[PDB]
């Protein structure tokens, strides 16, 4: 019976999109059975710390790559699933992403990760490089 606070998760989503905002990541978490905004920041390293072993969550992160005239904004939708989270949870969570993709309309790529080493900034960017264009 998972649902989501669209009206609220959309504000966060838009906050990471808007360039002049400084916010580069917003999390979406389970607040019972209703998915809602978690934390957000300007520092990517602070996001990795939201991804503990007993939590599962969703994220929308703006990655900047290249430089000068080659600068491009790579958005990524991420589903962090704690290694120490239930078994039904992991699968039930993969179900709810559908519900999350209703607000989080476009992203160059999506991830289902449970090993922080995968959130390593330069590795995740490498991965966004091998991807391509948005997702409507």
Resolution (Å) of this entry: 2.8
Q: Which CA distances in Å does 86 have to 47, 53, 83?
A: 22, 11, 9
As to burial, measured by CB atoms within 10 angstroms (0-12 exposed, 13-18 middle, 19+ buried), residue 4 is buried
- The token pair at 106 is 């476009």
Q: Give the method of determination.
A: X-ray
Q: Which CA distances in Å does 82 have to 17, 70, 71?
A: 26, 35, 33
Cα–Cα distance for residue pair 98/100, rounded to 1 Å = 5
Cα–Cα distance for residue pair 80/78, rounded to 1 Å = 6
Question: CATH number of 1-136: 3.30.465.10, 1.10.490.10, 3.40.20.10, 3.30.1950.10?
Answer: 3.40.20.10
Q: How many CB atoms lie within 10 A of CB 123?
A: 11
Q: How big is the chain, counted in residues? A: 136
Domain ranges of the chain: 1-136
């Amino acid at each position: 019976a998972t649902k989501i606070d669209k009206e609220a998760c959309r504000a966060a989503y838009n906050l990471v999109r808007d360039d002049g905002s400084a916010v580069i990541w917003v999390t979406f978490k389970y607040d019972g059975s209703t998915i809602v905004p978690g934390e957000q920041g300007a520092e990517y390293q602070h996001f990795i710390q939201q991804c503990t072993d007993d939590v599962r969550l969703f994220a929308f992160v703006r990655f900047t790559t290249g430089d000068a005239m080659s600068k491009r904004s790579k958005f990524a939708l991420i589903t962090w699933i704690g290694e120490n989270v239930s078994g039904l949870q992991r699968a039930k969570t993969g179900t709810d992403k559908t519900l999350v993709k209703e607000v989080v309309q476009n992203f160059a790529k999506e991830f289902v990760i449970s090993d922080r080493k995968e959130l390593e900034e330069d590795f995740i960017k490498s991965e966004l490089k091998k991807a391509g264009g948005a997702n409507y």
